[PDB]
Design a protein around this ligand. Sequence first.
Ligand SMILES: O=C[C@@H](O)[C@@H](O)[C@H](O)[C@H](O)CO
Ligand SMILES: [Mn+2]
Lengths: 349, 349
Amino acid sequence: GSHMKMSFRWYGKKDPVTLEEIKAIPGMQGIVTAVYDVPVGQAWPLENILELKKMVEEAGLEITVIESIPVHEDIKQGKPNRDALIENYKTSIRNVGAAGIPVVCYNFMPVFDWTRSDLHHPLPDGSTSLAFLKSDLAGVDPVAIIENYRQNISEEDLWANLEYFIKAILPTAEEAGVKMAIHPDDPPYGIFGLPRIITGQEAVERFLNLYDSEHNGITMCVGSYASDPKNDVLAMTEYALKRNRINFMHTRNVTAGAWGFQETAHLSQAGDIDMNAVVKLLVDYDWQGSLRPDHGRRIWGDQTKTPGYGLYDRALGATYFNGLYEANMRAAGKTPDFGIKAKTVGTKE
Amino acid sequence: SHMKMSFRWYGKKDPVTLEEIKAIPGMQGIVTAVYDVPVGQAWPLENILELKKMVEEAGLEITVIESIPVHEDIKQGKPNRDALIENYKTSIRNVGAAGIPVVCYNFMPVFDWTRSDLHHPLPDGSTSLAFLKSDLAGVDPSKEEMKAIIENYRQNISEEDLWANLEYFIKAILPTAEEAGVKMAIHPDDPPYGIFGLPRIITGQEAVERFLNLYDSEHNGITMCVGSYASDPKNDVLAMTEYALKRNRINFMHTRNVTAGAWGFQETAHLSQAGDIDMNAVVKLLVDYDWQGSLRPDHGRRIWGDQTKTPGYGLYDRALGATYFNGLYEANMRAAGKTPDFGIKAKTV
Ligand SMILES: O=C[C@@H](O)[C@@H](O)[C@H](O)[C@H](O)CO
Ligand SMILES: [Mn+2]
């Protein structure tokens, strides 16, 4: 039976947005977070993870997803020493499973996790947002590693580097009781001479096949995949759902074409994704997992710094998914759940 | 079959701005009134225009006017009522002289609402308005004037008297309103039973049938505030909603959520499971019947340090409600076979 927990990204103690505020989002159940006191490729201790879990649980929430045990560039490059960094990744997986967190989200995006030309590109209602203007600058070197990928490492080398990775970690994830969920490339194609392989349906199928298990699944980030129109989110969503290989949902809306892309409000008609169709799919497939609204616009006085991570519009995206999820749950004669245990504190009949 | 998401704005003085209101996805209609004319006296075009101009420039539109307030003297049926009704006559005409097609208003002796507590705690740590009967048991409610206004209603004006006062008012103003294009929509009694020995008549299904029948004309309508009605458990808002739709008699919409008992009631998050109303069933019916008019998220919780001190009128939870209704709308539309729509012209600049 279906079981989708609303979740929200939270960067810990140093987050502009707090747990009180997050907790106040109607229907919010999960916290998506990570350890920030340890360098990339170095291995997360249990206590670190546990400190976060305690903060989150006292606030009346739970950590449902570690979003992002970062992958060291040595691993991605496929350099000689990877083995050591991978043993650290194995330790991290183990420590997350030790903490009781079911999913770990990661990426295999060489040197860049994402690219944005504009972090304040206005929208037809007064609100700013992030865009990828294919015209602007794009075609200029970002003022050792780069040339390596450019000169030496092909997409198939990256495919072989990734396969090595996932063959090395997967049994650990199995033993830990933890499911891996690879985040696609953002933008979902090669830029700056750098290669990208997690880019579309063909890529997803080849990925899942590297190690065939539920513990080896995807973060269906619909607004990344559909950043390149060449991609069709819904069949992607569905094949993945048909295969039981979606382990995390991200659900931001974006408008795209031959010209490139710009992130919009989550509403289906604000951009190019049919959001109702997405969750209708989760409904039909009795999907069990977490979804975050992912990214927001700047609206109101939102003085949250960090890119699409202001509380306000992401909140406005979550309740929109409450709507879509509840309606579709009901249309299917299913009864939706939002983790609400009490309506009131101190009254009752 | 187009519902236009809307939102109350309290004029130039509202700490909520139209920038902010326009920023909510899918938000089209604004909802406001004039605030510089005492109460009974006539509403000049100069005043309603100057607010319509303030809003039209902001990319938004007036869809409904929240309240030309009926004077106590009209409510009490005092002899001096005719002139007051006069001044009310032109308000309807001046407002029709602005394209604005709906006017909400109440017929509630003394107060327009009553709460015992304006920061009652909810389980998630947010706060909301609550009416708790037992806490208003002790209380005895110008100042020397209201006392005597209360004495008059208690001792001298009975329910039937107040029906009569209303009927007089209705048959007076309706042709005036059919003459101006404007549709009238009566805000239900809030709460919908006698407090402090004062009478209330707009309280349930019966009242509805009767009220409609005072002037069987599609311009004589209700504001279906499901929240006000569900505050009394004896009421079935789903049935009440449908009944009134089959008669083409919903001219405006308050979609607020409450939980309720013999103990009173408490406003909640708009999300169904947070309260006692199945908002999905509601919006579904609005869909099934092709209802055309504007729906409005009523009160919201106090969340995220919102300082706004007008009842339930901060921006945040109100907006979180709206986008949740976008999601309910869109989903139910597609589930029918119909195709939704919001304020959306251009996806991008
Ligand atoms: O429940 C009350 C609310 O609807 C308020 O906005 C207001 O007091 C009335 O609508 C106007 O009298
Ligand atoms: Mn109201």
